Structures are given as C-alpha cells and as structure tokens.
Amino acid sequence: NPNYCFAGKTSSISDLKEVPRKNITLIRGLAFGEVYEGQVPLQVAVKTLPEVCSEQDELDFLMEALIISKFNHQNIVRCIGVSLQSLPRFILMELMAGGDLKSFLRETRPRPSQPSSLAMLDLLHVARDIACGCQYLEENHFIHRDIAARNCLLTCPGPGRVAKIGDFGMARDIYRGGCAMLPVKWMPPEAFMEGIFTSKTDTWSFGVLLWEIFSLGYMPYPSKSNQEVLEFVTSGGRMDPPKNCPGPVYRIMTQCWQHQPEDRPNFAIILERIEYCTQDPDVINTALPIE
C-alpha cells in the first residue's frame, strides 16, 4: 500500500478512518465517479469509485482520500472517513450544500427578479475564505496546482455561506491526464513552459479565481482558446477588469499576475489586501451589474 507525506508526517491506508458500510445510507445523487448526499445522524457527501476501473484509478482514489484526510483547516473540506472495504468504494466528505462556486456565481447573479441576490461584500468574503485556505496550504508547502472556481465549494446558498477548497485531483495526479485537459487558463508562464511549480504558482491561479469571482462566474479570457491564452499571457497580455470591478480589487489580480514569481505576493499579503478592500466603503458600496 502506497504512503503519503504531508507536513513531514507519513500516513498509510491503515490510517484512514474506516466507516462500516452498514452505517452509511445514500439519499440522493448530486468525470470519474458519482457524488451522493448520504447519512452516517451525520449528513455527508459520498464520493464513489466505479467498480469498473483500472488499477491506477484505485490508487488515485486511495491517494485522494489520504491527502484530504491529512488537512486540518476550516477553509478546506473535511473528510469524515472512508468505506474502502466494500464495493463500490466510498470517500465520505463534509456536505457542501451550496455546491461549487462557479455554478453558484452563475446561478445567483443579480437579476431583475433577484436584484439583491449578491453584493460586493459577498464576493470579498468568498475571496477571503479561499485565500485563507491557500495560505494554510502555502505555509504547509502544499502546492495545489488547480486553484479555480470549479474546485471551490460553499457550505450553503445563503448569507452564512463559507467557501472552501474542495478538489485536489491535480495535486493527486502529480504526487502519483493530457495537454488538452491542462488548466492552462489558470497557469503562470513558468508552469506551462518549464513545468516549474512553487507556492507562487497558486498565487497566479488565485488571481484568475478572483477574476472568476468578480465577473460572477465567467470563463477566463473570454473568446480565447487555451493556446491563444498561452501566447497572450507569455507576451505580457492580461485580462481586463470584470464589469464594475473596483480598482483596488483589480489591482490585487494584476499583482497576482506578475510575470516573475518573486514579484507576486504570498498569501499573507493577499489576505491583507482583501481585508483592506472589505474595509473600504467605496469598494463595498459598488453595485454589481444586473444580468
């Protein structure tokens, strides 16, 4: 059985919390594998492994479980446990009833029907939440490699919502795929060119996430293909501000997208700047566009 190393500690399959299959009930459904709402009474999300899978799929599933179980931070989704001794195999996760952030932003855009569905402060709180999770990863020397709205989840649709990093499939693949499947639109020049990844890698990606958030769920680099973005970004090109985006927020993005990694802020600094934006009445009193 493969081992996993995080924060200088080594863990094994043996260390995962095995939940007896009889204690787990699937309630309703919600790539590779399906996700269900379940009960263990503890409400959970259940990720399944297809019984029809390869040996590599099995090891991938196991590794995902090990990685997530070893994190301990409020802005990273919790792993409640596993059921790997029965088929199909399960991973039991914190239930995130708000769903993924990209879908949420698109579905919850201000509308003539829902004129006040979202405000600038909601977006800043989501950004802060994810930045706090990224800071935890950075201080523990874990490089995520795929920070993006589709990989963040919300605890609930409503006002008390908390955003958390909820998918680690890229980091898993790299720990042990194809060019067309690479998240090139979230990647800094040195990553897609030299294959060099550092904590500054995630800073660049976080800048793109910020654009996703303040555009309310638009695909990055509108109208550009992956290769067109690669050439654009390599030549110094950067995205324009999202519609109605406050200047202080856009400035955070442009700092995250500095060509040289040593010129980009660490997440401690990013958090400070997000905090300062949240304090500025002129930022938070800016109206979002109505769809």
7: left (phi over 0), alpha (psi -120 to 50) or beta: left
Residue with tokens 């802060």, as numbered in its chain: 128
Pick from 269, 290, 114, 153: which is nearest to 207 by CA? 269
Distance CA 257, CA 191 (A): 13
Residue 253 burial (10 A CB sphere; 0-12, 13-18, 19+): buried
Q: Which residues pair with 36 in a beta bridge?
A: 29, 46
Q: Where are the domains of the chain?
A: 1-95, 96-280
| 47 annotated to a ligand binding site | yes
**96 marked as part of a ligand binding site:** yes
* Longest CA–CA separation in the chain, Å: 57
The residues that bridge with 164 in the sheet, in sequence order, are 153
What's the rounded Cα separation, in Å, for the pair 149 and 209?
Answer: 6
Phi, psi at 44, each rounded to 5°: -140, 165
In angstroms, this model's resolution equals 1.9
SS3 6: strand
Cα 241-162-104 angle, rounded to 5 deg = 55
- Say if residues 154 and 163 touch (Cβ distance below 8 Å): yes
Its sign, for the CA torsion 262, 265, 267, 268, is positive
CATH dotted code for 96-280: 1.10.510.10
Number of Cβ within a 10 Å radius of residue 21? 13
Report the catalytic residues: 146
Dihedral pair phi/psi, residue 26, rounded to 5°: -90, 135
Say if CB 90 and CB 198 are below 8 A apart. no
Q: Which two tokens stand for residue 130?
A: 């994810």
- Specify the residue for token string 């259940």: 46
Q: Are 277 and 248 in contact (CB under 8 A)?
A: yes
Kindly state the tokens that stand for 149: 């709205």
Structure tokens at 90: 């399960």
Burial of residue 51 (number of CB atoms within 10 Å: 0-12, 13-18, 19+) = exposed
Q: What is the rounded distance in angstroms from the CA atom of residue 193 to the CA atom of residue 10?
A: 32
Cis peptide before 88 (omega within 30 of 0): yes
Experimental technique, in short, is X-ray
For residue 272, give the amino acid letter: E
Amino acid at 214: F
Specify the CATH number for 1-95; select among 3.30.70.20, 3.40.1440.60, 3.30.2010.10, 3.30.200.20: 3.30.200.20
Q: Residue 60 and residue 158: Cα distance in Å, rounded?
A: 34
**DSSP assignment letter at 222:** T
Tell me: is residue 102 an annotated ligand-binding position: no
Residue 170 annotated as lining a ligand binding site: no
Alpha helices in 180-225 (DSSP H): 189-194, 199-214
Query: What is the per-residue DSSP string for 91-152?
Result: EEEE--TTEEHHHHHHHT---SSSTTS--HHHHHHHHHHHHHHHHHHHHTT---S---GGGE
Q: Are 111 and 117 in contact (CB under 8 A)?
A: yes
